[PDB]
């Protein structure tokens, strides 16, 4: 969400358009990691309880790695938040500073 | 997803149905408080941006109680899998697996 409404709320002159999209592929990337992860573990949890409906060390495990994926989902989000920042003109950053803060206000409501 | 995807789904009988509703009332006051912190983090990050955009200790500190409120939404809704589990009469149970195992399955593609 965080990193939707950000992607959508700034206008951007080609140069700094042309920097983003190259900070995008990147994060893309670790994303993709993380999600990959996350897939693998499910996979694991799916296999554990369809052999045992119980919390077995691999059901444990499994769920360490889940906990793991989404924690470092939401870090990847936030660096990400703000390597964009840093591909802004200065005087472009106030803008981005206005809406970044909104959309976190509006999660701590 | 996960709790939403099990309950759309499953024949409750009516000794089950009032146990699982109960069980929905302690895992929601769960999801309550975890959300809690995750608004509180956020408020932080706010708050934190507003006076320095930069990733201060204080961004430091707050993401990281953003990944562990992640991290632990996760493992509180698999604990609460398995206690709805305990509760149906075993003849019930496999309806509830294979919509619980199926849903990780997709949740691994
Ligand atoms: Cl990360
Ligand atoms: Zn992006």
Same mark, same amino acid.
């Given at each position: 969400?965080?990193?939707?409404?950000?992607?959508?709320?700034?206008?951007?002159?080609?140069?700094?358009? $042309?920097?983003? $999209?190259?900070?995008?592929?990147?994060?893309?990337?670790?994303?993709?990691?993380?999600?990959?992860?996350?897939?693998?573990?499910?996979?694991?949890?799916?296999?554990?309880?369809?052999?045992?409906?119980?919390?077995?060390? $691999?059901?444990?495990?499994?769920?360490?790695?889940?906990?793991?994926?989404?924690?470092?989902?939401?870090?990847?989000?936030?660096?990400?938040?703000?390597?964009?920042?840093?591909?802004?003109?200065?005087?472009?950053?106030?803008?981005?500073?206005?809406?970044?803060?909104?959309?976190?206000?509006?999660?701590?409501?």
């Amino acid at each position: 969400d965080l990193h939707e409404i950000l992607h959508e709320a700034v206008p951007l002159d080609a140069n700094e358009r $042309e920097i983003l $999209e190259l900070k995008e592929d990147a994060f893309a990337q670790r994303r993709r990691e993380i999600e990959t992860r996350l897939r693998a573990a499910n996979g694991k949890l799916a296999d554990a309880i369809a052999k045992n409906p119980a919390w077995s060390p $691999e059901v444990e495990a499994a769920t360490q790695e889940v906990e793991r994926a989404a924690g470092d989902l939401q870090r990847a989000t936030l660096v990400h938040v703000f390597e964009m920042r840093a591909g802004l003109k200065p005087e472009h950053r106030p803008a981005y500073d206005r809406v970044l803060i909104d959309a976190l206000r509006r999660g701590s409501q």
